[PDB]
Design a protein around this ligand. Sequence first.
Ligand SMILES: COC(=O)c1ccccc1CS(=O)(=O)NC(=O)Nc1nc(OC)cc(OC)n1
Ligand SMILES: COC(=O)c1ccccc1CS(=O)(=O)NC(=O)Nc1nc(OC)cc(OC)n1
Lengths: 349, 349
Amino acid sequence: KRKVVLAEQGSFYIGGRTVTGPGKFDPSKPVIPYSNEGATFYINQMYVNFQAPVRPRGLPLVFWHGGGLTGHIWESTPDGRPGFQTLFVQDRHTVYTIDQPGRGRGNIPTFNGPFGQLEEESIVNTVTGNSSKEGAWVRDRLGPAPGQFFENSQFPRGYEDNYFKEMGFSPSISSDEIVDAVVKLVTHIGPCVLVTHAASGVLGMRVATHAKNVRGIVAYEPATSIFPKGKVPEIPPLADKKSQIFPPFEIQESYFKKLAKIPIQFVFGDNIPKNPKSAYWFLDWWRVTRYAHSLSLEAINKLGGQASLLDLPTAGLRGNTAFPFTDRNNVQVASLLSDFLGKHGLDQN
Amino acid sequence: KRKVVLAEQGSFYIGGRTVTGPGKFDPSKPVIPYSNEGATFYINQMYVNFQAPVRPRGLPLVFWHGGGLTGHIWESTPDGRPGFQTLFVQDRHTVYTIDQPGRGRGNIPTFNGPFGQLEEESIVNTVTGNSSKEGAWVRDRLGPAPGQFFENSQFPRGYEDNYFKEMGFSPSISSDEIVDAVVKLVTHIGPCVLVTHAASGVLGMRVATHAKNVRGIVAYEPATSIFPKGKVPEIPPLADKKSQIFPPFEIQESYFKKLAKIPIQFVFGDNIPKNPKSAYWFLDWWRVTRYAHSLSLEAINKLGGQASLLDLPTAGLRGNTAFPFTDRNNVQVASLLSDFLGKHGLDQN
Ligand SMILES: COC(=O)c1ccccc1CS(=O)(=O)NC(=O)Nc1nc(OC)cc(OC)n1
Ligand SMILES: COC(=O)c1ccccc1CS(=O)(=O)NC(=O)Nc1nc(OC)cc(OC)n1
């Protein structure tokens, strides 16, 4: 179950740009304390890990963590069971896992001065935002309130601390530059499949419209829907009659139609309510967000696409959280990903 | 050369604490934008990756990156050659690599507000520091000035972008909390060997004084010297007759004497001058820092220890930078680490 045979493995940095401070660098002057004087800084580069099996079969997979996460979530579950990285190397795919710009081993662009500030220029905001444990508990649908689990939950109970410890803030790097890094990676890899999650869902869709090497997308519980510009459907507010879901991302129709040329699957876990739930904001948020994604997939299909929505309970998997790939049944979730890859020949050479 | 067979691999979080915001969390209220209200935040936890060979022998190795770095530097070289992780799994050791608190996949403690501030409390400083490409070039002795290489250089020339992209800032987490996280990892692992680098040199020495499971230390180009409290020898200023090296860390002699109970090796690369070099600040800095370390090792040996200094040129390896384990001859550098492990019985069951 745990053994892994790698023809090769490693990591590298890709993407990003440079910014420079004022003045010149004099090697005779004290280098420490570090100074912006004469400085070149590499910023917004992304970290990439790869593991290649012996005799790979089919396209490499690029696993793209959700918001505030890192490639760790594809390596192991919080209770230490194998993650999708191991599972799909065993399934004979070369596997890439990334830490996007601003997360984990990706760059956090800060310098000598207030966070994110290079002299008078603000590269990212000094004021940060970050979810609490409580916010993440309900966002991920462990249960309706912090410390409470749904009866059917597939969460690895007892490993809560390990789970929340993987989560953190993201600096205000432009989403354009995050997409740019992954487009450059896709150019480097060749034909591949993007496997996204939550906040990276919309980013992966954007990458596909810029990179024909993306031959398929599987998105686990994507957080932001995408529509052709000017063509966002009517989407209701939340049950509290004042909140809304994340504003849908709009792209030019000519780019949106590129999503119709590849197989795309959105995967949702359990315990998303069918009816308005004003008492549980993030449960109600998921209800309307999943609805919006269903309309997004229909728009892709009306343009000739191959887009589908997989509710895991309809496949007989009950209780999954918003991280199905680290839940107790993640081997069965991986089986369904293998099925999708096989259906579209993405597991053949 | 690149093939690797793993009995198991994965990653996990360990260490850290929690801090809390005021008030109570209400799941019916909008969870986004994120708020400190009723918040629990997990801070200062550390990321740990492991790869175990089939039929391990000897003690697991814990590779601990230098300042502003991550476990990446043990995975691959900037030009994509295998790092010590792969080399020592092939050498049949279980290999742990860490991203320490504040670096990479370790936690960066920040919240909703100015960087590092939780309401009125400063958890880490809002003002950051970070080396430039230019400062790192001379710090790591690629050459005497940015753009220049020493004649004998083992640096992977042409891969400067990859190399400097792996580097970044560290928030002002207390070193005590970084040491604490690794003490907990060492407690979890059992008897093990610490392999440190630059900034983690002094931190690994401290870990060993709190953790009898550390059975050996190899430190690559450590940045801060350590002495018993009140017994810091006279150390000269730098050639500019105004700068000093890093203030030596002082610990109680009852803890310092624990360093005499295990084999300890400091490894230095090439192009550290023998004579004062006022034109090249960081070259002179290394001259005096290496001298201070030589006095540190002597103090350990005067307490009955087995502490040695290995200059790679004396072993016939020329041109190494301050990252010998990612230089072009890093296989030969690894051979010398294997020799150390073998001599001291750390490669035996
Ligand atoms: C696993 O975590 C996620 O990636 C996730 C999952 C479910 C719902 C939302 C998210 C992303 S987040 O919770 O981190 N959102 C966030 O920080 N604020 C925020 N607010 C917006 O409203 C205008 C728009 C926006 O676009 C990404 N992000
Ligand atoms: C690979 O990089 C390193 O770890 C390294 C290598 C050689 C020299 C120094 C370092 C650490 S650092 O350069 O990042 N130092 C730093 O930010 N300032 C700073 N100043 C101090 O005394 C004034 C004390 C102090 O050690 C805790 N660090």
